[PDB]
Design an enzyme around this catalytic site. Structure first.
Site, PDB file in Angstrom:
ATOM      1  N   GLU A 221     -21.587   4.060   1.370  1.00  0.00           N
ATOM      2  CA  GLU A 221     -22.221   4.074   2.658  1.00  0.00           C
ATOM      3  C   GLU A 221     -22.389   2.464   2.919  1.00  0.00           C
ATOM      4  O   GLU A 221     -21.984   2.103   4.135  1.00  0.00           O
ATOM      5  CB  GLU A 221     -23.789   4.434   2.694  1.00  0.00           C
ATOM      6  CG  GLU A 221     -24.282   4.764   4.024  1.00  0.00           C
ATOM      7  CD  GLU A 221     -25.780   4.628   4.116  1.00  0.00           C
ATOM      8  OE1 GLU A 221     -26.451   5.427   5.211  1.00  0.00           O
ATOM      9  OE2 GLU A 221     -26.419   3.873   3.396  1.00  0.00           O
TER      10      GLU A 221
ATOM     11  N   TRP B 125     -24.582  12.056   6.159  1.00  0.00           N
ATOM     12  CA  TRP B 125     -24.180  11.763   7.515  1.00  0.00           C
ATOM     13  C   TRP B 125     -23.763  12.946   8.372  1.00  0.00           C
ATOM     14  O   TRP B 125     -23.568  12.848   9.469  1.00  0.00           O
ATOM     15  CB  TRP B 125     -23.247  10.765   7.835  1.00  0.00           C
ATOM     16  CG  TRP B 125     -24.317   9.328   7.853  1.00  0.00           C
ATOM     17  CD1 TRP B 125     -24.297   8.404   7.062  1.00  0.00           C
ATOM     18  CD2 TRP B 125     -24.922   9.042   9.111  1.00  0.00           C
ATOM     19  NE1 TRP B 125     -25.279   7.624   7.498  1.00  0.00           N
ATOM     20  CE2 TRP B 125     -25.655   7.619   8.644  1.00  0.00           C
ATOM     21  CE3 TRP B 125     -25.341   9.325  10.218  1.00  0.00           C
ATOM     22  CZ2 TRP B 125     -26.337   7.051   9.269  1.00  0.00           C
ATOM     23  CZ3 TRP B 125     -26.101   8.727  11.075  1.00  0.00           C
ATOM     24  CH2 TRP B 125     -26.764   7.477  10.862  1.00  0.00           C
TER      25      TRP B 125
ATOM     26  N   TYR C 211     -24.881   1.400  12.914  1.00  0.00           N
ATOM     27  CA  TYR C 211     -25.032   0.532  12.028  1.00  0.00           C
ATOM     28  C   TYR C 211     -24.005  -0.448  11.813  1.00  0.00           C
ATOM     29  O   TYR C 211     -23.890  -1.703  12.361  1.00  0.00           O
ATOM     30  CB  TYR C 211     -25.737   0.790  10.828  1.00  0.00           C
ATOM     31  CG  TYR C 211     -26.597   1.761  10.643  1.00  0.00           C
ATOM     32  CD1 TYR C 211     -26.740   3.092  10.864  1.00  0.00           C
ATOM     33  CD2 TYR C 211     -27.980   1.308  10.511  1.00  0.00           C
ATOM     34  CE1 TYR C 211     -27.610   4.085  10.731  1.00  0.00           C
ATOM     35  CE2 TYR C 211     -29.282   2.426  10.661  1.00  0.00           C
ATOM     36  CZ  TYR C 211     -28.897   3.534  10.750  1.00  0.00           C
ATOM     37  OH  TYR C 211     -30.021   4.302  10.944  1.00  0.00           O
TER      38      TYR C 211
ATOM     39  N   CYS D 179     -32.607   3.025  11.509  1.00  0.00           N
ATOM     40  CA  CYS D 179     -33.711   3.263  11.096  1.00  0.00           C
ATOM     41  C   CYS D 179     -34.175   1.905  10.559  1.00  0.00           C
ATOM     42  O   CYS D 179     -35.120   1.261  10.616  1.00  0.00           O
ATOM     43  CB  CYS D 179     -33.819   4.322   9.957  1.00  0.00           C
ATOM     44  SG  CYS D 179     -33.725   5.952  10.659  1.00  0.00           S
TER      45      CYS D 179
ATOM     46  N   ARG E  93     -37.857   1.011  11.040  1.00  0.00           N
ATOM     47  CA  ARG E  93     -38.653   1.569  12.014  1.00  0.00           C
ATOM     48  C   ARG E  93     -39.255   2.980  11.608  1.00  0.00           C
ATOM     49  O   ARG E  93     -40.533   3.300  12.007  1.00  0.00           O
ATOM     50  CB  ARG E  93     -38.016   1.438  13.228  1.00  0.00           C
ATOM     51  CG  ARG E  93     -36.891   2.717  13.442  1.00  0.00           C
ATOM     52  CD  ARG E  93     -36.559   3.060  14.752  1.00  0.00           C
ATOM     53  NE  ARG E  93     -35.254   4.057  14.621  1.00  0.00           N
ATOM     54  CZ  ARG E  93     -35.532   5.143  14.639  1.00  0.00           C
ATOM     55  NH1 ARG E  93     -36.713   5.661  14.434  1.00  0.00           N
ATOM     56  NH2 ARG E  93     -34.383   6.026  14.600  1.00  0.00           N
TER      57      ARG E  93
ATOM     58  N   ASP F 193     -38.425   7.755   5.696  1.00  0.00           N
ATOM     59  CA  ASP F 193     -38.476   8.917   5.299  1.00  0.00           C
ATOM     60  C   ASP F 193     -38.692   8.745   3.741  1.00  0.00           C
ATOM     61  O   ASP F 193     -37.907   8.770   2.920  1.00  0.00           O
ATOM     62  CB  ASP F 193     -37.292   9.758   5.346  1.00  0.00           C
ATOM     63  CG  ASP F 193     -37.424  11.170   4.614  1.00  0.00           C
ATOM     64  OD1 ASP F 193     -38.288  11.592   4.102  1.00  0.00           O
ATOM     65  OD2 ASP F 193     -36.418  12.080   4.771  1.00  0.00           O
TER      66      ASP F 193
HETATM   67  C1  LIG Z   1     -31.802   6.469   3.936  1.00  0.00           C
HETATM   68  C2  LIG Z   1     -30.457   6.786   3.749  1.00  0.00           C
HETATM   69  C3  LIG Z   1     -29.075   7.345   4.097  1.00  0.00           C
HETATM   70  N1  LIG Z   1     -28.997   8.707   4.637  1.00  0.00           N
HETATM   71  C4  LIG Z   1     -28.700   9.048   5.883  1.00  0.00           C
HETATM   72  C5  LIG Z   1     -29.824   9.795   6.593  1.00  0.00           C
HETATM   73  C6  LIG Z   1     -29.502  10.549   7.868  1.00  0.00           C
HETATM   74  C7  LIG Z   1     -30.487  11.243   8.336  1.00  0.00           C
HETATM   75  C8  LIG Z   1     -31.815  11.569   7.843  1.00  0.00           C
HETATM   76  N2  LIG Z   1     -32.786  12.147   8.539  1.00  0.00           N
HETATM   77  C9  LIG Z   1     -33.950  12.296   7.762  1.00  0.00           C
HETATM   78  N3  LIG Z   1     -34.837  13.105   8.311  1.00  0.00           N
HETATM   79  N4  LIG Z   1     -34.159  11.857   6.605  1.00  0.00           N
HETATM   80  C10 LIG Z   1     -33.320  11.017   5.918  1.00  0.00           C
HETATM   81  O1  LIG Z   1     -33.587  10.398   4.775  1.00  0.00           O
HETATM   82  C11 LIG Z   1     -32.040  10.944   6.532  1.00  0.00           C
HETATM   83  C12 LIG Z   1     -31.002  10.120   5.791  1.00  0.00           C
HETATM   84  C13 LIG Z   1     -29.301   9.708   3.498  1.00  0.00           C
HETATM   85  C14 LIG Z   1     -29.148  11.045   3.994  1.00  0.00           C
HETATM   86  C15 LIG Z   1     -29.405  12.008   3.054  1.00  0.00           C
HETATM   87  C16 LIG Z   1     -29.527  11.781   1.780  1.00  0.00           C
HETATM   88  C17 LIG Z   1     -29.759  13.092   0.854  1.00  0.00           C
HETATM   89  O2  LIG Z   1     -29.532  14.092   1.399  1.00  0.00           O
HETATM   90  N5  LIG Z   1     -30.407  12.897  -0.133  1.00  0.00           N
HETATM   91  C18 LIG Z   1     -29.489  12.366  -1.462  1.00  0.00           C
HETATM   92  C19 LIG Z   1     -30.291  11.794  -2.742  1.00  0.00           C
HETATM   93  C20 LIG Z   1     -30.664  10.287  -2.499  1.00  0.00           C
HETATM   94  C21 LIG Z   1     -31.711  10.044  -3.205  1.00  0.00           C
HETATM   95  O3  LIG Z   1     -32.059  10.344  -4.362  1.00  0.00           O
HETATM   96  O4  LIG Z   1     -32.709   9.184  -2.821  1.00  0.00           O
HETATM   97  C22 LIG Z   1     -28.705  13.465  -1.918  1.00  0.00           C
HETATM   98  O5  LIG Z   1     -28.830  13.855  -3.148  1.00  0.00           O
HETATM   99  O6  LIG Z   1     -28.082  14.057  -1.042  1.00  0.00           O
HETATM  100  C23 LIG Z   1     -29.578  10.624   1.458  1.00  0.00           C
HETATM  101  C24 LIG Z   1     -29.511   9.413   2.406  1.00  0.00           C
HETATM  102  O1  LIG Z   2     -31.340   5.162   6.826  1.00  0.00           O
HETATM  103  C1  LIG Z   2     -32.067   5.850   7.349  1.00  0.00           C
HETATM  104  C2  LIG Z   2     -31.796   6.760   8.153  1.00  0.00           C
HETATM  105  C3  LIG Z   2     -32.662   7.843   8.445  1.00  0.00           C
HETATM  106  N1  LIG Z   2     -33.897   7.890   7.981  1.00  0.00           N
HETATM  107  C4  LIG Z   2     -34.946   8.722   8.094  1.00  0.00           C
HETATM  108  C5  LIG Z   2     -36.400   8.546   8.658  1.00  0.00           C
HETATM  109  C6  LIG Z   2     -36.811   9.371  10.053  1.00  0.00           C
HETATM  110  O2  LIG Z   2     -37.471  10.441   9.470  1.00  0.00           O
HETATM  111  C7  LIG Z   2     -35.071  10.228  10.142  1.00  0.00           C
HETATM  112  C8  LIG Z   2     -34.822   9.559  11.822  1.00  0.00           C
HETATM  113  O3  LIG Z   2     -35.502  10.251  12.624  1.00  0.00           O
HETATM  114  P1  LIG Z   2     -36.066   9.416  14.015  1.00  0.00           P
HETATM  115  O4  LIG Z   2     -36.967   8.268  13.471  1.00  0.00           O
HETATM  116  O5  LIG Z   2     -34.826   8.649  14.461  1.00  0.00           O
HETATM  117  O6  LIG Z   2     -36.861  10.180  14.987  1.00  0.00           O
HETATM  118  O7  LIG Z   2     -34.331   9.761   9.349  1.00  0.00           O
HETATM  119  C9  LIG Z   2     -34.435   6.792   6.734  1.00  0.00           C
HETATM  120  O8  LIG Z   2     -35.187   6.910   6.340  1.00  0.00           O
HETATM  121  N2  LIG Z   2     -33.133   5.904   6.470  1.00  0.00           N
END
Ligand SMILES: C#CCN(Cc1ccc2[nH]c(N)nc(=O)c2c1)c1ccc(C(=O)N[C@@H](CCC(=O)O)C(=O)O)cc1
Ligand SMILES: O=c1ccn([C@H]2C[C@H](O)[C@@H](COP(=O)(O)O)O2)c(=O)[nH]1
Ligand SMILES: NC(=O)C1=CN([C@@H]2O[C@H](COP(=O)(O)OP(=O)(O)OC[C@H]3O[C@@H](n4cnc5c(N)ncnc54)[C@H](OP(=O)(O)O)[C@@H]3O)[C@@H](O)[C@H]2O)C=CC1
Ligand SMILES: NC(=O)C1=CN([C@@H]2O[C@H](COP(=O)(O)OP(=O)(O)OC[C@H]3O[C@@H](n4cnc5c(N)ncnc54)[C@H](OP(=O)(O)O)[C@@H]3O)[C@@H](O)[C@H]2O)C=CC1
Ligand SMILES: C#CCN(Cc1ccc2[nH]c(N)nc(=O)c2c1)c1ccc(C(=O)N[C@@H](CCC(=O)O)C(=O)O)cc1
Ligand SMILES: CCCc1nc(N)nc(N)c1N1CCN(c2ccccc2)CC1
Ligand SMILES: CCCc1nc(N)nc(N)c1N1CCN(c2ccccc2)CC1
Ligand SMILES: O=c1ccn([C@H]2C[C@H](O)[C@@H](COP(=O)(O)O)O2)c(=O)[nH]1
Lengths: 511, 511
Positions: B282, B304, B330, B390, B411, B414
């Site tokens: 990424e 993604w 980004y 984010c 901002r 999660d």
């Molecule tokens: C932050 C960021 C990048 N991102 C992009 C991304 C996009 C939308 C999101 N939306 C929400 N609600 N939470 C997120 O964390 C999130 C993250 C990620 C998205 C998913 C995973 C995930 O499914 N978990 C991993 C485990 C990673 C870990 O162990 O921490 C996996 O196993 O698939 C990781 C990163």
């Molecule tokens: O790099 C990232 C991308 C997304 N998120 C999580 C946080 C939020 O729960 C969600 C985005 O939702 P909004 O903040 O856009 O509503 O994805 C992360 O923690 N890190």
């Protein structure tokens, strides 16, 4: 060994017309109540008062329960009080003596095992007596920050610099600022001066392996201004000496955090007078999206002048800019982000993205949304600016109780000069938005990048870190009904209440 | 009567090979061992106990161990072999020999009472296996070598060896931060066997004085992951329940900070396995300024995918976007800030601000500059994005010793899923930038504005909190000489060394 408990205005006033000068201070009452009652078993506490002080009390509260009440009086007798109201079970009968020295002997005589701590509880007669006889080891003072009409006063004493500007009493405890009925106050205590862990220990011993303090004697540090003061000390003790764009040397650290409560009082730092007229005038200027600095200067706010002179504009390589023009700076980006700048005189209405308006609309309709941001940083326009924005971003947040908080991120922090101005500036913005969105102000959070104190300010800051802070004042929005939009605020719509800072400190602005 | 074990150990419990130590010389460990065995509260000294081969494996200049009573368990070696080995210095103890550890403990009582303070079993497997059998071992001082090494002598198995790797007891009571020497990361744990001077200030504290904790038995919390763990526990206990954009319940806080060192090891969280391949691929994706999420998807990185479906793209009111096109996200703002977006397939070379280039250049030329920032937040372009950034801003800083620190502002965080990933991702970037600028990586600072746990993770997180962190791994950049610019990096150019996480915990992503 006795203690003096008091609530007290900055001019040492304590009463008027045999009564309290201020509207009810509920938290003071609760504090007084706790202090005079709580004890580590068999023992209870002793409260000593004067006749006028006894008489002023509403009949509902006299005698002070769970406490050996004592009155000093020549004219009232033990029977008047016994017959004033029927006595209740579980208490001692109020005792009356000629003077305080006499009243103390009575405690030595009859109550040598029953009572723990003694408290002189009012009024001017008794407080004065105790100060003369020097048996008072501690002062539990409630500093009321607002001035009130008074006829009875607390006697002057060595170290009453804690109240206002001018065998000693030094502060040993300073609490965060509370407020009730639009009256800001806080609590101080002045002191009369004149093998479950053995296994871990040696492992810690080899690890540690290697100066300046803020108001060192003050041990319990409730006051939120301690953040700023501990932050100064820290940078001086543990910073790194750097060079600069200015040429003036710098001691800096990277990554720092303070936060300030907005519900009880306003964080207008009290350890040196903050130029509040300046924060107000400038924030108003920001909100208009005004980029002409002469509008600030003509109002007696010369903060941006050194940075918009003919000379500086050309060092910044902008010969075509009129004197005063900050280019497309903070205000502009808030109200017209990414718009095509011309000059300070151009009308940019409807142009760019109105970040401010969007933030408010979001706050009013969907306050759980996590995209409530406003940025001043615009990579594409930086060169056109007279100076890249320091405070460049702010995020807003709402919780369950409709309480609004605000985070501001600043890349470059002048700690001596800029920081207290930037604290008050964004704390004010929060109040403005909160009012306009129908929200309670909760908290302001300060996020700092390169955090630095200039070497030529270091002498002056050491002086500042000897000063113990005063209670934060209250800022009120006036004309609450008239103001419905963020653009409706004017300079006359605010009133700082109870601001009693220490005297001014001269610091040169790095040009 | 109670004895203490002191050991440096491999994840697979390995302690030695070829009558020697498996790893290169770990200096901090040597210091740790030196002090823990020597330091005493005047007249007394400490006893150290070892097998014959441990005594044999030791360098000649170090044996016997100075200021300690050396004792060797053996049947071949005799006391006069050791005396006629090295001339005795004046003031030391004569090394003793016994047939068994029980006999050794006898010798300690019988003769060396009033003489020895603490007893330390010091190796090898024979004696460690013995000390656990008898049940006289009160405390185990374990140095956790995170890297795997060739070994032929192992530490005995014991209840509570889950502190080393995945599966009367031994529970941790002290876990230190990660240290590294010669490319070997390691930390220090200590296991336990379980089966009115200031009183005048305390009453005012009472009415001001006021449920889920992480690894509570552990009292010293040096390990830097405790930040994350305590940040989970804080939100859960003191958070406010909000409704969400995604529709799922949330518990939240506003803004919190964390900071992680990058000089010794790498903050790749251990208490649950982080999808490193994801972070790496990424980050590179970002660097390229790539907006095509398919390129992530074809590599086995689907993070993604749930946000670039026809469904989400249409819900985001973007009908004309091809599936996978994250919009101007980004990477794109980093490399082409403010450029007019068409689609993910267009070449944008030379358009918009290349913020990342400008940051590297300033770092390489003018490191004391305070405008070394890079932002992904672009209000004019937000509506065209599949998802607003984010982590929207990051700032760099260099100090005295040419060390690079970085701040990242997020901002929306999660905490369960995204935060660990984000700590790894900007820490990785900070290593990458430091290498290209010729700097030492020092620190990564995490500012998160809105920090939250999703309510459909609360069970998974309380579980995670029972787990104690393992040492941080070292991340190495391979092929250093080849890589001269930020774009020179590829997936193969990174090696993760000594990573030993706890089992993967399934946590779903909210769309
Ligand atoms: C932050 C960021 C990048 N991102 C992009 C991304 C996009 C939308 C999101 N939306 C929400 N609600 N939470 C997120 O964390 C999130 C993250 C990620 C998205 C998913 C995973 C995930 O499914 N978990 C991993 C485990 C990673 C870990 O162990 O921490 C996996 O196993 O698939 C990781 C990163
Ligand atoms: O790099 C990232 C991308 C997304 N998120 C999580 C946080 C939020 O729960 C969600 C985005 O939702 P909004 O903040 O856009 O509503 O994805 C992360 O923690 N890190
Ligand atoms: N803000 C605060 O913390 C407090 C405020 N107050 C305020 O102060 C006022 C009451 O105090 P004040 O008016 O000063 O009256 P005092 O409580 O000082 O008492 C005055 C009377 O008590 C007797 N007395 C007092 N001191 C002595 C002494 N040293 N020796 C002998 N007799 C003594 C005298 O009786 P005699 O005439 O018979 O000799 C005198 O007339 C009220 O307005 C009250 O609201 C009171 C307590 C605390
Ligand atoms: N990483 C670490 O913390 C440590 C690592 N090491 C390493 O581990 C290895 C040493 O372990 P190991 O090979 O087991 O050798 P040991 O140090 O356990 O010594 C083995 C010999 O000591 C005697 N002995 C040991 N235990 C007993 C017992 N319970 N009863 C009677 N006699 C006993 C016997 O000698 P005899 O035949 O003479 O009776 C045996 O042959 C080396 O490679 C060393 O470098 C060692 C210590 C600490
Ligand atoms: C931050 C900011 C806005 N600004 C704009 C501004 C512009 C360039 C700067 N440059 C530097 N190096 N430091 C600054 O703090 C700074 C501030 C200010 C500029 C000057 C003063 C000043 O001269 N001090 C006030 C005291 C005000 C106070 O106590 O806070 C004075 O009366 O002189 C204050 C604010
Ligand atoms: C209700 C707060 C009054 C108070 N607050 C603090 N901080 N210190 C004090 N000494 C007092 N007193 C003592 C009792 N007192 C009194 C007056 C009317 C009713 C009840 C008590 C007169 C003023
Ligand atoms: C350099 C530290 C070795 C070490 N570290 C830890 N954490 N626990 C141990 N038991 C050991 N020992 C004891 C001494 N020892 C030894 C001492 C000098 C040279 C060679 C070996 C054999 C291994
Ligand atoms: O609101 C402000 C404005 C300016 N500064 C200070 C910080 C820097 O020392 C200086 C600007 O210099 P650069 O950071 O732009 O180099 O002004 C502040 O602290 N706060």
């Amino acid at each position: 060994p006795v203690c003096l408990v008091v609530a007290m205005t900055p001019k040492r006033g304590i009463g008027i017309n045999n009564g309290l000068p201020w509207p009810h201070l509920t938290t003071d009452f609760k504090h007084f109540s706790r202090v005079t009652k709580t004890t580590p078993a068999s023992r209870f506490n002793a409260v000593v008062m004067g006749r006028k002080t006894w008489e002023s009390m509403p009949r509902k509260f006299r005698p002070l329960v769970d406490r050996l009440n004592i009155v000093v009086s020549s004219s009232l007798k033990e029977e008047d009080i016994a017959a004033e109201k029927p006595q209740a079970e579980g208490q001692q009968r109020v005792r009356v003596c000629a003077s305080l020295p006499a009243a103390l002997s009575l405690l030595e005589e009859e109550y040598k095992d029953s009572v723990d701590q003694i408290f002189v509880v009012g009024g001017a007669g008794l407080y004065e007596a105790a100060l003369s006889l020097g048996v008072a080891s501690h002062l539990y003072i409630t500093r009321v920050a607002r001035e009130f009409p008074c006829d009875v006063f607390f006697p002057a004493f060595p170290g009453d610099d804690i109240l206002s500007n001018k065998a000693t009493y030094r502060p040993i405890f300073i609490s965060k600022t509370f407020s009730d009925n639009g009256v800001p106050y806080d609590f101080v205590v002045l002191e009369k001066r004149r093998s479950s862990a053995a296994a871990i220990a040696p492992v810690l011993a080899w690890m540690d392996e290697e100066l300046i303090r803020a108001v060192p004697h003050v041990h319990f540090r409730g006051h939120e201004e301690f953040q700023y003061l501990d932050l100064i000390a820290d940078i001086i003790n543990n910073g790194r000496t750097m060079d600069d764009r200015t040429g003036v040397g710098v001691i800096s650290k990277f990554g720092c955090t303070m936060r300030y409560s907005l519900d009880q009082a306003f964080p207008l730092l009290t350890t040196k007078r903050v130029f509040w007229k300046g924060v107000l005038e400038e924030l108003l200027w920001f909100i208009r999206g005004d980029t002409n600095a002469n509008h600030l200067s003509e109002k007696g706010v010369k903060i941006w002048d050194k940075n918009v002179t003919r000379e500086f504009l050309d060092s910044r390589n902008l010969p075509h800019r009129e004197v005063g023009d900050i280019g497309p700076g903070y205000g502009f980006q808030w109200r017209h982000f990414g718009a095509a700048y011309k000059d300070m005189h151009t009308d940019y209405t409807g142009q760019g993205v109105d970040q401010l308006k969007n933030v408010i609309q979001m706050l009013r309709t969907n306050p759980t949304d996590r995209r409530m941001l406003m940025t001043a940083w615009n990579p594409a326009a930086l060169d056109e600016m007279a100076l890249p924005p320091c405070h460049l971003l702010c995020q807003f947040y709402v919780n369950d109780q409709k309480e609004l908080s605000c985070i501001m991120y600043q890349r470059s922090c002048d700690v001596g000069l800029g920081v207290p101005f930037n604290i008050a500036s964004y704390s004010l913005l929060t109040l403005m938005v909160a009012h306009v969105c129908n929200l309670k102000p909760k908290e302001f959070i300060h996020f700092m990048g390169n955090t630095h104190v200039y070497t030529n300010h270091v002498e002056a800051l050491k002086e500042q870190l000897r000063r113990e802070p005063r209670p934060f004042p209250i800022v009120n929005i006036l004309n609450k009904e008239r103001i419905k939009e963020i653009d409706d605020f004017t300079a006359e719509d605010f009133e700082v209440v109870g601001y009693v800072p220490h005297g001014r400190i001269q610091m040169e602005m790095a040009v």
